[PDB]
Amino acid sequence: SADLRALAKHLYDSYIKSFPLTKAKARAILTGKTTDKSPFVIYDMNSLMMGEDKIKFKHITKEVAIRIFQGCQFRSVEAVQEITEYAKSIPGFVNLDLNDQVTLLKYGVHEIIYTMLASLMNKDGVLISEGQGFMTREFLKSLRKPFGDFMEPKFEFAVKFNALELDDSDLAIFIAVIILSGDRPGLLNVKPIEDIQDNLLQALELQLKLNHPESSQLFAKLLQKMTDLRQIVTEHVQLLQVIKKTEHPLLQEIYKD
Amino acid sequence: NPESADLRALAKHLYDSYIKSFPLTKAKARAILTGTDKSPFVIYDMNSLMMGEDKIKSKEVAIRIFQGCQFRSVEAVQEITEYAKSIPGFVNLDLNDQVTLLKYGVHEIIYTMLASLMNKDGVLISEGQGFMTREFLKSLRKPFGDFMEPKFEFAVKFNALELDDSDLAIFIAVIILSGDRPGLLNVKPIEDIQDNLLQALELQLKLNHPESSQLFAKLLQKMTDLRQIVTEHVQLLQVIKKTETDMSLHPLLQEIYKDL
Ligand SMILES: Cc1c(C)n(Cc2ccc(-c3ccccc3C(=O)O)cc2)c2ccc(C(=O)N[C@@H](C)c3ccc([N+](=O)[O-])cc3)cc12
Ligand SMILES: Cc1c(C)n(Cc2ccc(-c3ccccc3C(=O)O)cc2)c2ccc(C(=O)N[C@@H](C)c3ccc([N+](=O)[O-])cc3)cc12
């Protein structure tokens, strides 16, 4: 193995083709090492409006919090399809029982979305609209209850996770590992899922020992970050359908997932 | 390797202090459950319970069971404190952070070790002298009937990993040194110790079990299930507090639940 490297390469390539905005580009934009385009900054309501007028977002279908929230829903639905297409390229995935494919995606897309979301975040805000914009953290937190603490856990997590300084080639395999979780509810055949995940974990371990030679504890710290991820999801659910306080039907049908 | 040797030394140290801290190990529990040790008297209904009191172990069943769990929880906290102090670096931390780490760690550790006393049919009681069935515990009047069931649910899943005491020692050490506890002052020393503990556990599982990295991942993942049952427990506790007002909660446990 000899194969963990091949698998790493394949997953990296697939990752590049599946996700338009990589962490490398995102960091280039956030630091400003290339500029080349400073992102349109949204820090309050007027800049939000002006941004809506300039960029003309595709999800604009009339209250700030609601609009931001629905933008998040739209981007999330795009992300799900990107992640699905990436999942299909994981060696062995399409050979799994179709039910299990659907289950794995259904229960993994959240964790993966937050993982990749960390790539678009620093301690001060998040890249928005394909990287064309940047929304401040303070503006997100200043939204009315309950939307005030919607984005915050993702920011906490993103800070602590970005402290690990993973690059795209690490993240590809990390995401692959997350997808192939054998403890999703309602799985019919766990064995191949965990065999594949075993191979993926080995690939990840090697990839980390090679890409990050200075640190021997990174693997354990990452695997530990997975649980952080899952509880971020757990808490997010609790905050999520507590937003059934809201109100249409066809749109809600699009986002009923 | 040298680093490997360090990790092994840490593992042996932790297992040693684990054996010295906890009088009821998983090895003894399994020796009792699977017929070296005496066989337990089994309580599975009211009659066998009343006989069980004489065989031997205000008297309302659900309440008395609740209080028993409480007593054993106080003892467990004392044992866990003693163990925590044996973890290298712990006693050198800020005192407030020691208190915080214990405060948020004891529940997760207690349920972790409780799994060792459980099978899908029930749980050892009275230092392994007894065995109370899962269904008898479910049959307790509301709301005490739902007290133990989540712990059983977790216990089955967790026991499926087939860990032994030498694994558990490092795992609970990892749990204690959690850097994401609310209200910590110095996170970095804590996470520094925990990283070492995580490496020690990874190597331990590597030497003691197959597909060790996957086992490592699953085990680490169990902490989600753990925090889940802690949450459910606290909620049930709120209910009980409201409907059973003549009931004492031990001051120590109160300190633990205060502004959790
Ligand atoms: C995929 C994704 C992105 C790109 N962002 C940042 C973002 C995206 C869009 C905008 C934005 C805002 C206003 C105007 C334009 C834009 C813009 O950038 O286009 C800002 C930041 C997210 C923020 C949160 C979540 C999330 O917590 N949960 C998902 C699974 C979910 C999300 C929602 C629900 N839900 O309750 O329906 C369930 C799960 C997901 C995402
Ligand atoms: C430490 C512990 C043990 C050994 N058992 C099994 C047991 C223990 C005692 C008995 C028993 C029953 C009757 C007579 C004698 C015994 C006996 O063996 O001694 C049977 C099984 C437990 C069961 C539940 C909990 C729990 O859910 N939460 C803790 C933090 C807690 C537990 C309780 C409370 N509380 O509010 O009371 C707060 C937190 C903890 C424990």
Side-chain angles (χ1 to χ4, degrees), chain A residues 2-32 34 36-55 57-60 63 65-143 146-208 210-213 215 218-233 236-237 240-241 243 246 249-251 253-255, chain B residues 2 4-35 37-52 54-55 60-66 68-141 143-211 213 215-217 219-227 229-235 237-257 259-260:
Chain A
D3 307 317
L4 311 181
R5 282 290 96 191
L7 178 56
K9 175 83 171 71
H10 173 78
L11 290 178
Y12 175 72
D13 298 330
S14 179
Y15 176 95
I16 294 298
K17 312 182 178 205
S18 294
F19 309 106
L21 193 58
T22 64
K23 186 187 180 179
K25 240 141 34 167
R27 292 291 123 172
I29 301 178
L30 285 163
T31 59
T34 197
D36 255 32
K37 321 113 40 182
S38 276
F40 196 92
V41 180
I42 300 181
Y43 54 92
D44 64 347
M45 327 203 333
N46 276 342
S47 53
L48 169 65
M49 235 159 310
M50 180 171 305
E52 283 168 350
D53 287 26
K54 157 171 192 67
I55 325 290
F57 307 106
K58 284 207 159 28
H59 47 66
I60 298 168
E63 171 196 355
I66 308 299
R67 309 202 288 199
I68 291 165
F69 179 79
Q70 170 164 281
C72 292
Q73 292 184 313
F74 188 96
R75 297 307 175 189
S76 301
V77 160
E78 289 179 311
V80 167
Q81 293 303 314
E82 290 169 4
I83 301 166
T84 299
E85 218 51 41
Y86 177 66
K88 279 170 166 294
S89 66
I90 301 174
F93 186 85
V94 296
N95 296 326
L96 301 173
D97 190 294
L98 304 162
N99 300 277
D100 289 352
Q101 297 184 40
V102 176
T103 299
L104 289 183
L105 290 175
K106 171 164 143 64
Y107 291 102
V109 286
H110 276 72
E111 293 157 23
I112 299 157
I113 276 168
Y114 296 146
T115 296
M116 297 187 304
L117 181 61
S119 288
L120 310 182
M121 288 172 159
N122 58 33
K123 76 181 157 286
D124 293 312
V126 58
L127 281 180
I128 71 178
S129 192
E130 308 178 15
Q132 311 178 12
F134 177 83
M135 185 171 287
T136 72
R137 184 179 177 176
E138 256 325 317
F139 172 56
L140 284 171
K141 186 181 339 183
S142 66
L143 299 168
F147 297 94
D149 313 302
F150 176 68
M151 289 296 292
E152 203 59 28
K154 294 94 182 217
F155 276 107
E156 313 170 345
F157 171 80
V159 169
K160 230 145 59 197
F161 185 77
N162 290 340
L164 299 180
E165 312 216 62
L166 309 172
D167 50 45
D168 290 305
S169 43
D170 306 325
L171 290 164
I173 312 179
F174 181 61
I175 289 167
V177 167
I178 298 178
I179 289 162
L180 278 298
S181 298
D183 62 344
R184 309 301 192 189
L187 287 172
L188 296 170
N189 191 9
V190 181
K191 186 179 187 299
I193 300 173
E194 298 208 309
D195 293 333
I196 297 176
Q197 195 197 45
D198 177 36
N199 289 328
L200 293 171
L201 285 161
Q202 291 197 77
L204 181 64
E205 202 187 334
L206 181 48
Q207 156 77 217
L208 293 183
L210 295 179
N211 194 36
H212 305 252
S215 182
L218 191 55
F219 181 66
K221 277 186 280 190
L222 193 50
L223 289 195
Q224 186 187 28
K225 281 281 160 277
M226 272 172 57
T227 77
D228 286 14
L229 209 45
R230 289 212 184 174
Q231 141 161 44
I232 261 58
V233 174
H236 192 245
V237 148
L240 219 43
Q241 292 184 59
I243 311 179
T246 269
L250 212 46
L251 205 85
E253 201 57 59
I254 295 165
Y255 296 122
Chain B
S4 296
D6 283 317
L7 271 32
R8 296 315 296 163
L10 181 56
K12 305 197 156 157
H13 170 77
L14 292 174
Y15 177 60
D16 180 70
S17 70
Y18 172 97
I19 294 305
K20 289 170 172 173
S21 296
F22 305 106
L24 189 43
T25 66
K26 183 176 181 182
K28 182 167 179 175
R30 296 308 158 178
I32 297 171
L33 284 168
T34 66
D37 285 283
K38 330 298 165 326
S39 296
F41 183 87
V42 176
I43 294 166
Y44 63 96
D45 66 348
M46 284 291 313
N47 182 61
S48 62
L49 162 70
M50 136 174 311
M51 283 184 181
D54 319 315
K55 220 89 136 193
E60 195 212 316
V61 176
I63 302 310
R64 280 185 332 189
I65 290 170
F66 192 77
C69 296
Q70 190 152 180
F71 179 79
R72 297 308 182 178
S73 303
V74 178
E75 292 189 320
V77 169
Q78 304 185 257
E79 294 163 9
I80 292 162
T81 300
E82 222 59 34
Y83 180 71
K85 290 154 66 178
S86 74
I87 308 175
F90 183 84
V91 300
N92 307 122
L93 299 169
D94 190 286
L95 182 51
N96 300 289
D97 285 347
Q98 298 183 29
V99 168
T100 300
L101 290 178
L102 283 173
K103 175 189 183 66
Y104 286 86
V106 283
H107 271 89
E108 301 170 4
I109 296 166
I110 280 175
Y111 297 141
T112 289
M113 300 188 60
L114 176 57
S116 306
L117 309 179
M118 289 180 153
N119 59 34
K120 73 165 180 293
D121 290 330
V123 58
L124 288 176
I125 78 169
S126 197
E127 290 155 23
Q129 284 173 334
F131 179 90
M132 194 164 298
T133 64
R134 182 176 178 173
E135 223 63 43
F136 171 71
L137 285 167
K138 279 186 70 175
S139 75
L140 299 174
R141 57 104 162 172
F144 297 102
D146 281 342
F147 176 79
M148 204 71 66
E149 186 62 21
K151 288 80 176 180
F152 278 112
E153 288 181 15
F154 165 76
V156 170
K157 297 181 192 175
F158 191 80
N159 289 345
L161 299 178
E162 312 214 87
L163 307 171
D164 52 45
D165 293 301
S166 56
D167 309 317
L168 296 176
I170 318 184
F171 177 64
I172 73 189
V174 169
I175 290 177
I176 297 177
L177 275 292
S178 295
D180 62 344
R181 307 306 199 188
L184 287 173
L185 308 178
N186 306 311
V187 175
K188 199 33 209 157
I190 301 177
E191 287 196 349
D192 276 331
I193 300 169
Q194 194 191 50
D195 287 344
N196 292 326
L197 294 172
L198 285 164
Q199 285 197 249
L201 176 61
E202 184 191 357
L203 184 52
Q204 162 73 11
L205 297 174
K206 202 155 284 184
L207 301 168
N208 209 22
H209 303 284
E211 34 270 43
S213 79
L215 178 69
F216 184 50
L219 171 57
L220 286 190
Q221 187 59 260
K222 291 292 162 293
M223 287 172 43
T224 297
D225 295 90
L226 219 39
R227 293 168 196 242
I229 76 184
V230 177
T231 294
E232 297 185 29
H233 176 80
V234 170
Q235 288 169 3
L237 218 53
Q238 296 158 347
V239 172
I240 296 172
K241 152 200 276 178
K242 286 164 179 296
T243 64
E244 319 293 324
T245 194
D246 65 330
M247 177 165 290
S248 306
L249 210 68
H250 196 291
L252 186 55
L253 299 181
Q254 281 187 32
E255 153 97 15
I256 292 166
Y257 290 110
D259 316 345
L260 180 63

